[PDB]
């Protein structure tokens, strides 16, 4: 996200990775969905399963990865890209933990770009704008 805001036009596939960080005996299932651009984000688990999805049992497999095929938004002044796609997660089952593991278990997500990812038309990043000891390099 940060390196792409130095550029105007971006393009390519991305790489999500979700890591389950519960206990060893925590079990359950998730539906990780991919909604393409244009399509509506699912609101139910059943609509979620009808799309491109992953039924991920995290009872033994702690990490799952998913290729995001080709988002590719840009910058417009004549206005944003807005909706270019969604990754959505639903509970297929309940979280099943033993009575000595914690009730609450956490997921973390990762994103990387793939080798087809490309950036174009370098601009200024909007992230940090403008302080102390500034005029010390002059006196």
């Amino acid at each position: 996200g940060n390196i792409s805001r130095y550029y105007t036009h971006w393009s390519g596939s991305l790489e999500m990775t979700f890591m389950f960080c519960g206990s060893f005996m925590a079990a359950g299932k998730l539906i990780l969905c991919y909604t393409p651009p244009g399509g509506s984000c699912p609101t139910t688990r059943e609509t979620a399963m009808l799309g491109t999805h992953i039924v991920w049992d995290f009872g033994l497999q702690s990490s799952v990865t998913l290729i995001i095929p080709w988002i590719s938004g840009s910058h417009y002044r004549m206005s944003t890209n807005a909706n270019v796609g969604y990754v959505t997660c639903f509970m297929q089952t309940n979280l099943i933990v033993p009575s000595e593991s914690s009730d609450t278990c956490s997921l973390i997500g990762f994103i990387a770009a793939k080798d087809d990812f490309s950036l174009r038309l370098m601009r200024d990043s909007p992230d940090i704008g403008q302080l102390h000891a500034a005029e010390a390099a002059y006196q």
């Binding site: 359950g28 299932k29 399963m49 999805h53 992953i54 039924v55 049992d57 033994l60 099943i96």
Partner: protein, 230 residues
């Protein structure tokens, strides 16, 4: 190992061995049996994907669950849309049943696929009606699992294609169903070739009186054909 089929994928770590029902793998309709409706069309992917049902709660007083195929899928996705627009169909099935238990849960499940499970009703002469049979995605519950709700026995239900889930050894089961009919095509809205039954032979148990295990059913149509329409 992942069960990848279409844009659906069942992403697990442990799944040992499938059951191939009657040793038969699902193939398409061969070019000597198709004297009928000319060249039954094949989407080849659009139906052939896992349809993961709503999970059922296994508890200590569970008698069992059943889904009828293709009635469990006749209103779901591109399978269920092709069922409403087409008149004939032919499909096998990949069924994956999975349990979410810890090493402190116990219990055994007979996961059995029954060809043409004509059901009986209990303590009456009237046949089961339409709503007593065609339950859809929700499926049904065994009233008397010991007789398989048809006057037979559950003890001999291993004559059918079956898998055991003993929570010591495994939590998953895979049955691969071929086309099971006396006709090459059939009529999906009014006849079922398979009933997937999941029956707890040994009931569920841990100590704190409210032991509960998710059971998840994923059904994939295999080699699913339909009549022409063009």
């Amino acid at each position: 190992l992942q069960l990848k089929l279409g844009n659906s994928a069942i992403v697990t770590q442990e799944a040992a061995n499938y059951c191939c029902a009657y040793g038969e793998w699902p193939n398409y309709l061969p070019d000597h049996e198709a004297v009928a409706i000319d060249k039954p069309t094949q989407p080849e992917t659009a139906t052939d994907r896992f349809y993961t049902l709503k999970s059922v709660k296994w508890e200590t007083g569970s008698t069992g669950w059943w889904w009828k195929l293709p009635d469990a899928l006749n209103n779901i996705g591109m399978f269920g849309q092709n069922v409403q627009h087409h008149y004939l169909y032919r499909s096998g099935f990949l069924i994956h049943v999975q349990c979410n238990a810890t090493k402190f849960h116990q219990g055994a499940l007979l996961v059995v696929a029954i060809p043409e499970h004509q059901r009986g009703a209990h303590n009456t002469n009237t046949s089961p009606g339409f709503d007593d049979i065609m339950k859809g995605e929700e499926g049904g519950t065994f009233n008397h699992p010991y007789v398989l709700d048809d006057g037979t026995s559950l003890a001999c239900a291993t004559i059918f294609p079956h898998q055991w889930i003993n929570l010591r050894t495994n939590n998953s089961a895979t049955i691969v169903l071929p086309w099971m009919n006396a006709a090459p095509m059939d009529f999906p809205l009014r006849h079922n070739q398979w009933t997937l039954a999941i029956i707890p032979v040994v009931p569920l148990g841990t100590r704190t009186t409210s032991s509960m295990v998710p059971i998840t059913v994923s059904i994939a149509p295999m080699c699913c054909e339909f009549n022409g329409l063009r």
